[PDB]
Amino acid sequence: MVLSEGEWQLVLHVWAKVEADVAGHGQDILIRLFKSHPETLEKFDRFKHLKTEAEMKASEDLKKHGVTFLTALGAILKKKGHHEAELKPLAQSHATKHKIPIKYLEFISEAIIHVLHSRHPGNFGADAQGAMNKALELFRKDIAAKYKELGYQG
């Protein structure tokens, strides 16, 4: 799939707002995923023991990881599709070390879109959400092909 330049602009405009608070968004998104799909929390051996959303908010480690995760995603989106080199180390660790099924990457895409919609309504109307969605479907499609090449899932 190929996004047009206008779709990438809608994506990078709302991302420029997200980057004013990277740790806050990282945190909001991971919690949102864990709440919505609690099975995903089991993949993290470091956070698994968290029991409530209050425990999640208060975990410094979780917040540090939400910064790591978000930065990496930001770096991929700013490539505007040309992300082959970035995708390599990510596909290898998530498919071989962490073992993260594509279905989970669909759950986290839904969590990203929930949070942006909550925090940035004026910059995330229907066309901007369609563009963000296109960009994460592109990322999932490419990661899924990498996964196959690595021997995982398909």
Residue positions forming the annotated binding site for O2 = 65
Choose one: 8-16, 20-28, 99-107, 123-131; the region binding ligand HEM (CB under 6 A): 99-107
| Per CB under 6 A, 44 contacts ligand HEM | yes
| Per CB under 6 A, 90 contacts ligand HEM | yes
Of residues 122 and 151, the one with the C-beta less far from ligand HEM: 151
| Per CB under 6 A, 111 contacts ligand HEM | no
* Interatomic CA distance for residues 55 and 70, integer angstroms: 21
Sign of CA dihedral 106, 135, 154, 85: negative
CB of 122 to ligand HEM, least distance (A): 24
With CB under 6 A as the contact rule, the residue among 72, 84, 88, 96 that binds ligand HEM is: 72
| Per CB under 6 A, 73 contacts ligand HEM | yes
| Per CB under 6 A, 93 contacts ligand HEM | yes
**DSSP strand E in the chain: where?**
none
Q: Which amino acid is at 130?
A: G
Q: Running DSSP on this structure, what letter comes out for residue 151?
A: T
Of residues 61 and 127, the one with the C-beta less far from ligand HEM: 61
* Interatomic CA distance for residues 141 and 110, integer angstroms: 15
| Per CB under 6 A, 110 contacts ligand HEM | no
* Interatomic CA distance for residues 40 and 63, integer angstroms: 17
| Per CB under 6 A, 17 contacts ligand HEM | no
The two tokens of residue 25 are 């968004």
> What's the half-sphere exposure (Cβ side, CA atoms, 13 Å) at 63?
12
Biggest CA-to-CA distance, the chain? 43
Interface ranges with ligand HEM (CB under 6 A):
40, 43-44, 46, 65, 68-69, 72-73, 90, 93-94, 98, 100, 104-105, 108
